[PDB]
Amino acid sequence: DRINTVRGPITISEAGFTLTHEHICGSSAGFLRAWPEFFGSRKALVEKAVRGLRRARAAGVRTIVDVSTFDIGRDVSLLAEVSRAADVHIVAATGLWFDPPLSMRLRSVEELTQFFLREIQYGIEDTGIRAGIIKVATTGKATPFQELVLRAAARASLATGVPVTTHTAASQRDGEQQAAIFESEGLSPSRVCIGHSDDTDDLSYLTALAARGYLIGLDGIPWSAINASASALLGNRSWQTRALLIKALIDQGYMKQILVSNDWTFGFSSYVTNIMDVMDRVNPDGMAFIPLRVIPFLREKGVPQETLAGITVTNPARFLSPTLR
Amino acid sequence: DRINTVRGPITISEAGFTLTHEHICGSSAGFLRAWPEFFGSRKALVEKAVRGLRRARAAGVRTIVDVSTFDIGRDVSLLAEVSRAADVHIVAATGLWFDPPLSMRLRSVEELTQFFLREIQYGIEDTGIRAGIIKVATTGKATPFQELVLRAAARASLATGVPVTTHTAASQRDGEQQAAIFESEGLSPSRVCIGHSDDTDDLSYLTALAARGYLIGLDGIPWSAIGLEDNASASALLGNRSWQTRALLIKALIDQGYMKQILVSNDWTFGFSSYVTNIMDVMDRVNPDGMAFIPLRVIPFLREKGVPQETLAGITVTNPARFLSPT
Ligand SMILES: [Co+2]
Ligand SMILES: [Co+2]
Ligand SMILES: [Co+2]
Ligand SMILES: [Co+2]
């Protein structure tokens, strides 16, 4: 039941404090290799990533789950280099996000299942690095292709025991549609995380999924823009409003169904040019925002350490551990 | 006299018979590295590519211009490996086609000009291999992003002298909007090939572009789905126009007095992942000659139709030579 990382298999006890939805670099397939000067240089991106992960480590984080898929420009060699120099375990991902190229979008469910399985059972590229999580996406009502991906992600999870994590348009209640698709394939709700759930205030949506066994991804707490580009991406809602949703779900009793993270990055190319510079101004803490700002905020709101350590250590370790239920 | 190939700089006299629009692998950025099993294996694709290029070489081909851009999944390491093993010069490309990812789509004209210049002046990725052509595209009326890419291509061409080649929806007469954008930037027509021009029978459209100095890419001569109208996917891609109809356009433009403006190719590939699954198998059944189709079938066909050997040698050797030479 060992969890696969970019450096090799680790046990449940070695995982520790885990951020379930992070990115070393938010890019596009082949971009980092073709145009490293966009990030200054590859060396400059590595140096920035090592510094940010070491800051996260000093604050308490032992493992981060890089949910960067093929189309988000996942570079496992970059992930391996920064994991080694920072002494933070990184769990790599397979799956598809909302920017698949023609070679991915014209594939059948059988073919996409084989691709996700290739990255989990054999390895990513020629590196032998196996993925320990599957990332998928929907932005409103699922397109015939997005449904096909969710099904392929479910089938790949049922043959390996590896978990599935999603990107949602939470306000449009995507988690319910994704649920219906995952359940029709026979996937256990305990192997799924309905991510970006901190984008909505609808508690009757979050509790309904958490009661069925789904893990709720309140994975982007520092995302706030309190000018168009930063506002359209990060949103109008504050970090406190997103952190009060962690509190609200513990008050509903569904404490064991919570996964917290930052959804941060050290390189961003899939959006406008200076978005990374604006993001580093909004949150200078980076990935260290959860143990330095969110946890002490929840402690001052009435949530004990036994509960917060269960959300950060026990919940991700149970989520990442290969099993069918 | 000098052009950049995947094996390094060569003199233009060494280029010889050149196919101006080919692909070793029609894919997507990062696809070949992440899923080589789609093509059997990377080794299987290489061996298939080497066999095909060696057969094309035995038929007379000395150089092919791989117009695969970043988003067509250009893997220059593969291009170099196959070029060396087959002993056929391969010119690599920069530019952007019609499947750019978000990291390319959100860029400004200035940023894309810098990316194209990097691949031409510095190198592709960390390989040191420099692009000798810029490939761009439109599929009907140009989107604001396509117009931006064409401007960046024009600016990269003006600074380096490397030619620009295009994908067009010839039936929509795309070459005219492309030409208008290129000339508004000050780019000379002699540095541009309006490709996929064999997809139209409109001689008025072709001759007018040729009269302005544009090179006309009659680049997919074996593309035909005749006999397989049963297959919806093969018909939508390959079309229902015969290889003979496509080849007769070469003769039509020669007869109009535009022999110096013609560039001929197959637009072939050894790996195809950017469309339906078994398309490569279907294509190999329609044309077993592959890239060798031009010298084995098209040249003897045109000779039998009355076109002199010297005119055909001028189209396959002299025209690509003048086109690829930086100026
Ligand atoms: Co997301
Ligand atoms: Co994310
Ligand atoms: Co084309
Ligand atoms: Co082509």
Distance (Å) from the alpha carbon of A308 to chain B's nearest alpha carbon: 37
| Beta-strand runs (E) in chain B | 2-5, 8-11, 18-22, 63-66, 89-91, 93-95, 133-137, 164-167, 192-194, 215-218, 262-264
Q: Which of A31, A73, A103 sits opposite B273 (nearest CB)?
A: A103
Q: How far apart are CA A38 and CA A270, in angstroms?
A: 11
User: How large is the C-alpha radius of gyration of chain B?
Assistant: 18
Q: How far apart are CA B202 and CA B197, in angstroms?
A: 9
Given the structure tokens 């143990």, which residue do they identify? A291
Residues near ligand 3 ion, CB 5 Å cutoff: B 167
What residues of A are in contact with residue B99 (Cβ under 8 Å)? Answer: 101-102
- DSSP, residue by residue, A237-300: S-HHHHHHHHHHHHTTT--TTEEE-----S-B-SS-TTHHHHHHHH-TTGGGHIIIIIHHHHHT
The two tokens of residue A258 are: 């919570």
Q: How far apart are CA B34 and CA B18, in angstroms?
A: 31
Contact B199, B218 (CB under 8 A): no
SS3 B194: strand
Contact B292, B270 (CB under 8 A): no
| Structure-determination approach | X-ray
Q: How far apart are CA B130 and CA B117, in angstroms?
A: 10
Does residue B89 have a known ligand-binding role? no
Interface test with B, best of A28, A41, A71 (most B CBs within 10 A): A28
Domains of chain A (ranges plus CATH)? 1-325 (3.20.20.140)
| Torsion of Cα atoms, B110 then B112 then B115 then B119, to 10° | -120
B6 interfacial to chain A (CB closer than 8 Å): no
Tell the burial category of B26 from Cβ atoms under 10 Å away from its Cβ (0-12, 13-18, 19+): buried
Please name which ligand lies nearest the alpha carbon of A69. 2
Element (DSSP H or E) covering residue B313: helix B309-313
Please, which residues have CB within 8 angstroms of residue A293's CB and are 6 or more apart in sequence? A222, A239, A285
Interface test with B, best of A27, A102, A268 (most B CBs within 10 A): A102
Nearest to B172 by CA among B204, B139, B221, B218: B139
The two tokens of residue B260 are: 């110096």
Contact B132, B63 (CB under 8 A): no
Chain B, nearest residue to A123 by Cα:
B34
User: What one-character DSSP code corresponds to residue B316?
Assistant: I
Helix-helix angle B144-160:B109-121, to 10 degrees: 40
For residue B126, how many other CB atoms are within 10 A of its CB? Answer: 11
Query: Measured between alpha carbons, how far is residue B153 from residues A6, A8, B96, B158, B215 in Å?
Result: 39, 44, 9, 9, 16
Nearest to A27 by CA among B182, B30, B295: B30
Determine the residue type at A276.
M
Strand pairing class (A164-167; A133-137): parallel
The two tokens of residue A151 are: 């099904």
SS3 B201: coil
For residue B153, how many other CB atoms are within 10 A of its CB? Answer: 30
Please, which residues have CB within 8 angstroms of residue B65's CB and are 6 or more apart in sequence? B18, B19, B20, B21, B22, B90, B91, B93, B132, B133, B165, B265, B320, B324
Contact A188, A162 (CB under 8 A): no
Given the structure tokens 């006309």, which residue do they identify? B216
Q: How far is CA B51 from the centre of its chain?
A: 20
The two tokens of residue B303 are: 């000779």
Please, which residues have CB within 8 angstroms of residue A196's CB and are 6 or more apart in sequence? A166, A167, A168, A169, A170, A217, A219, A220, A263
Helix-helix angle A174-184:A203-210, to 10 degrees: 20
Please, which residues have CB within 8 angstroms of residue B19's CB and are 6 or more apart in sequence? B56, B61, B63, B64, B65, B264, B265, B266, B291, B294
Contact B164, B195 (CB under 8 A): no
Cα-based angle B91, B144, B136 (whole degrees, multiple of 5)? 10
The two tokens of residue B54 are: 């060696």
| CA pseudo-torsion sign B74, B72, B212, B182 | negative
Q: How far is CA B308 from the centre of its chain?
A: 25
Element (DSSP H or E) covering residue A22: strand A18-22
Provide the terminal-to-terminal Cα distance of chain A, rounded to the nearest Å.
12
